[PDB]
């Protein structure tokens, strides 16, 4: 009813027709660091500017969902340097630093952090969005991160 809409993208596996277009090293079925109540996470070892990229052509209309959200675990080290990018019209149209999205704090090691980004507020993007990616920006290898509960929200 009046409860705002949500669209799951990954909840212990891909949902709602989203597609794995990732080019970095990752697994969609990591079972070593899972949130309570889930069975799998995406594991991602950020390196060589790889990224986890979840795609669904024009599936997210900002007239229905204001934000993109995910839970991230910083693994052994935390504090990974990552860029979160939104894709519209088959091109990247906006990016944000994960530390920025986390209020200026580097993501904590060994524990799960909610990451919220607003399409208009954070990416200055509106209309139909084709996907989101989480990209390594260090090149040099970073400790493995875990991603869970990817969801589009009003």
Residue numbers in the entry: 552 to 705
From the reporting publication:
Here, we present the first crystallographic structure of a CBM8 family member (CBM8), DdCBM8, from the slime mold Dictyostelium discoideum, which was identified attached to an endo-β-1,4-glucanase (glycoside hydrolase family 9). However, affinity gel electrophoresis demonstrated that DdCBM8 also bound to soluble (single chain) polysaccharides, especially glucomannan, similar to type B CBMs, although it had no apparent affinity for oligosaccharides.
Initial phases were determined using the single-wavelength anomalous dispersion method using anomalous scattering of iodine, as described in the Experimental procedures section.
